[model samples]
Target: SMSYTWTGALITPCGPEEEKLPINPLSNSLMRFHNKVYSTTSRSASLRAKKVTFDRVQVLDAHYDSVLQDVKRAASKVSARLLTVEEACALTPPHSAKSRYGFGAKEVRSLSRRAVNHIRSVWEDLLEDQHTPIDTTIMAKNEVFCIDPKKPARLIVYPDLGVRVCEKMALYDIAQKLPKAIMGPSYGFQYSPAERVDFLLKAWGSKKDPMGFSYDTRCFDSTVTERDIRTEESIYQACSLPQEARTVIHSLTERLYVGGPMTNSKGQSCGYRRCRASGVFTTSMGNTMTCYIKALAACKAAGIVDPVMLVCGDDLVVISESQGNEEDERNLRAFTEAMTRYSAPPGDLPRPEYDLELITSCSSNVSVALDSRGRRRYFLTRDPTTPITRAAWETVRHSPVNSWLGNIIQYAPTIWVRMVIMTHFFSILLAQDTLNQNLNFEMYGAVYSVNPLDLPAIIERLHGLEAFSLHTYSPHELSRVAATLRKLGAPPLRAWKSRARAVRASLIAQGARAAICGRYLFNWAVKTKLKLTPLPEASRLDLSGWFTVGAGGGDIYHS
Candidate 1:
């Protein structure tokens, strides 16, 4: 069967769309190249549609079965139960898409009788029907990025709110807990930046002749086959579940999970989807599990010894023992061949890299910089193009969720985030006198309302006290940042430093946590830096689910 069967209806945008970034003093001061930042609109979505629609052919071998068995065995240890209607309703995000039955996200969140009734009806239907295809809405996802090549927006296929809540009831627990149980340390979302760096470094060091490579699948969600989805269902079925939970899970797997009919925003029949939907509760967990299984089987088939894999959905990095340079390259080719035979073909052929910094996975690479005492400290950093561009866009636009704040929190230790994003935003916030206001941001698919003053403590805990005082970045990382800034017409590092000093001085005038932010975050911007000490609030911060699980498409909420 094909991944999608379109009915000639257009994938429409929900509302008025902005194609170009608006010029404002706040954003333009941070980056002068507003034209370089572009938003994907419905006009360009046709290109994305063409890229995602295709026929898929898969061939599973004995190697796949071995990994499948191991996964099921691990899953057997997990216990999942159906969430109560109240629990499922509470889990829905406040801004989640609403149902066609006239109840919106607000009504669902409040568990209004109409919303609860519809949800229960959906659950009842799930128990009654086992072979019917559920309906899903297909829309173009608008996102901002640098105009390097002008990529199109991705397609999001999701069911109604009632079905979404039902999905959470059946699979929320499994999605939250299953991947880590099965994949263990290989699950990438289970680590913070510091922990991830430690894991990667340890994996790299464990090998006598360490060689690493990152694999990229061509449209990973579309690459999922019926057998693969059913295999994932089988793994979930192996879990200990309540009888009702098991029945609903099996029903969901047969009706909605495997494939579904697609509707456009205008209520026209858009297409039929037989592959994995990009906006479902199971998207991230299922993708991670399937990708890991395929990669692990490929590793065995290609004779890659002692491979340690880090998988975050479609992003995969494998560090393993090498058999000389020539042999390592040849084995990677064989691994790619194995992956292709299993229908998870690489977008670009994988290349074996001897240096850890050369291998990029999840859009980040391990890089080194010198700490205050001149000791080498390794941290994860990515090319700053997207982060800077998005930060600029967020500065001018009124967004419900602050992408800049999210970037700052997640990438506190990086050169671009600290020098450009933090300085730019802190300066703006200080000017506006809004540093004390709580802003909403997403981390690992969960929403958080955080005060700006709390950032110093959060960063210190996540990246360590050295994140504030780190300097003398690696030459390659420095050059990459410089090139990206130049290409995007952002201010140079010296300009940011000058601005950071001014922001720091003003922040210090405010006293207390604001001064703490100035001292720790902008320490690198000034020569007369204060001695860094751990913030008292850092130890008291409750950071429980921040790094434990990933719910990218799960529509999770934390109140």
Candidate 2:
């Protein structure tokens, strides 16, 4: 999630704003999309975007700024109330009143009473910069670990409405601006949309994809196939080969399906997308796949295999590996043929191809890893649930007052809005306050890795790389120290993704909280329409677990 969302003039007499440019083009096309979303949902009988005249509002970039200006001019022609950046910022956050992006457990943890006081002080200090007044749109909660040689761990922040609503805006943004529908990390989510059961086997097909030809899209129409992926978990379990694989895949799926981490954290994943030169087809999935593939390759180099194993119903092949010498090929071909039978391979030969290619030659004790996936520790995370449905969504959307203990744990970030907002985005915005949180996370950082080899490298580098221990993370602070593995000589592919998420998440929450832009906009909606008061606090529940269980990915509201 990004720590910032740029708000500037639609276009100025000078050239486009010469500042940070988000990769996702707020293209001329996106202007049309925004108009549509506003048009479709407006409460006013005849409100338009240009009704209220605005002298200045920063446009996106050189190309898109002109378009936004054109839009503003056209709206003026139609008498729409186009507001300035300050004006829009003053309004409540963009999504919707009932369901803006929801807060999560991470937010709740930092929103303690002490945290709130510290945050409120800073917010008051920054509030002077805003042209409009801001309100507290925050929430927080606490949760206990089920089985622990432990104390009750707090969930800090929970964002239900906020997350959902932000995602809603992103949907509109994606549907219009995103050239490709399949953007973001892919979920190994399986749905039995239709089923098919038959292998009209002919050729072994491409050496890489022997059974893929059988997966004809036309084969299943309306009828369910016997081999249909039965449920969400089934698909996830079936597809996600390793915990890291799922992490990358799920990020793609969430970004593509949900669109942007709350709209504000739009394009951080692509590193300003300078990494990708292609101007077209910049969707969540495309960016995510690039990162995923890169990460997968790096894991291989780092000796971490089985990131995302693929199977065409018994035709199993661990795709996350390099084509070594001739023996690897022979073993791979043999495995392909052997897997067609009705049974999954024996645990004793968990990775026959890899074993034939690398391990057996490396050591006798490593007699071709005999264990099936159970013993392999991949960080598969999520609280699963049945198919996504209206009932499930509603049950999880309630405010902190009526929710259960878990709900409070999940949604508390939304309850204690101030602290959660402050702490969650501390890296990008506030820093000194997060010394403790940062310290704890750093302890875990010593071991956790999307690539296993990172452990040793981190330990080696961090052992002597010392600096001031007082808290404050400059963007990509720990990443530099951690990713600089002397053994690897260069950073791993997955390193970028990890850094991108961490930096962007902090930046996004921080930017929004600091500006109070969206919240101000939301307040506008409340004042104009319903004379309603802001909630007492953010939703004091961390319904995040439910949200995760239902959605199955972290790429929802927060980017």
Candidate 3:
């Protein structure tokens, strides 16, 4: 790694710097409050060893009548009766909000102190994995990007990402509710831990769990992390990419994290990947998304092609080979415009506010070359006006989020790591279907529908009968997250960085098999963490958050 004089740590800003930021800001610690999503349980006297039930639960993310499929099924049921009551009472499915105890509650199931304690425990388990020796709890690569201020920012223009990404779709299924799902939590029937049983019941009643999906009575623990695909292998598997992508990738990894040029505080070389693309538009989702993926990329190349595929990641490009220079520039502008209009959110994405800023601030930061992806650098910049400097420039490259996620190591999936970039669109289906032609899929794209947020749209677009799921986080979820972190008191983000040279230093001390030793960490996460999948669990466990339970769920709906 080339050494450069770095200035003092700059107060790096996220989102638009001009927007009034929180004093404490919503830190990763703040987001860590999703302990409610995970649970820790010990066998109880009355509960069956593997008994799971969702007699009454409420889901929160369902959001609208896009329960078209369900409603249609109900209408088809000759025995079904359209129950009517006061709109206030009728809007909410019974037991969706309050516990079976009937307290005028907020979120379903209270976050027991026990549950919070368990989340912290999970974090600890990740660090304590007996085998792996590499310090990559917060494993990720970050970078700084600086673009021209005269143009638009890509982040603002493209903020709304529909529930197309696998994680996003799964999160969706976990979030939405019954009738109240649309009217918001105020209407009640939202998802929660207590609601877990209710979620199962809803599936049972609606026949949603027809495959006997919820029939498996298993305890939820480390098995939840299977197929998460948020890790290095996952990204590759999701985009049908290989972790060791190109010739330079392994070399880059050596340089970036082991014993090459760039190293971390431990004096190890950092991972490096030199990817060349002719027309590529990359966006920063969270932290240094561009850097994280780049470090994971072995290599990729794309040029003058519509939806040009890169070797390393799902980022896409559309280029022109024709002789007209003027036309080429026009096409680039339009393509940028199309990208600008895109959006995403758990609840609020696709809003014009998010989109406009993404294009204005995000687009203009990194260099916008005519026919080149530019010299290797962070993909996008927040402010184009600031000259790319060692201190300021380094801030752009170093990811507080990377350091943040890396440090916790345990809560990897809830990082809200996802993308809606269009070029990677086809890959979503292609990644899952082995029989499909090796088509030119994309990393980003839209989950189309007349109403973009329509729940049915996601359901219909997905591969199977019920393809997407929703997951939402509320204030109570925050409390649980905080409590868990307090228990763990995890290490700081600075300790986990592995830029290559530092990795090498550590490797030398550890011995020739140092990296081989590190491979255990990866194995531990995969073996224990991803043992069971949510799909199979859905069979026996009550979804418990929101939505109605049904019998013969598939027959009822599919009919």
Which one is best on lDDT? Answer: 1
Q: What's the distance in Å from true for residue 394, model 2?
A: 17
Candidate 1, superposed: residue stretches over 4 Å from native: 552-554
RMSD of each: 1.5, 26.0, 28.2
Model 3 is weakest, by summed lDDT over 10 consecutive residues, at: 550-559
Q: If both were scored by lDDT, which would come out higher, candidate 1 or candidate 3?
A: 1
Which pairs clash in the backbone of model 1? Answer: none
lDDT of 3 by residue, 1-559 (tens): 1111112222122222321112221122222222212111111211321121111121212211232223333222222111111211212212221222223212212333443333334324333442221221101112222221211111100100110111121111111222232122212123221222233233324421121100010211101111111222222122211222222222212222121111222333322111111011111111122222221121111122222111111221111233244543444343323222211001111111111112221122111111111222111212211111111222223321222211111111121111111101112222333212222110111010011112122222221111111123233333433343343332222222222224323333444333321222111212232221223322443323222211100000100
Each candidate structure's TM-score, on Cα atoms with residue i matched to residue i, is 0.97, 0.20, 0.18
Ranking by TM-score: 1, 2, 3
Q: Clash number for every model?
A: 0, 107, 147
Kindly list the per-residue Cα lDDT of model 2 for residues 404-429, writing each as its tens digit. 22221211112111121112222322
Once fitted onto the true fold, the runs of candidate 3 whose alpha carbons sit more than 4 angstroms away are 1-171, 174-305, 309-327, 336-559
Better of 1 and 2 by TM-score: 1
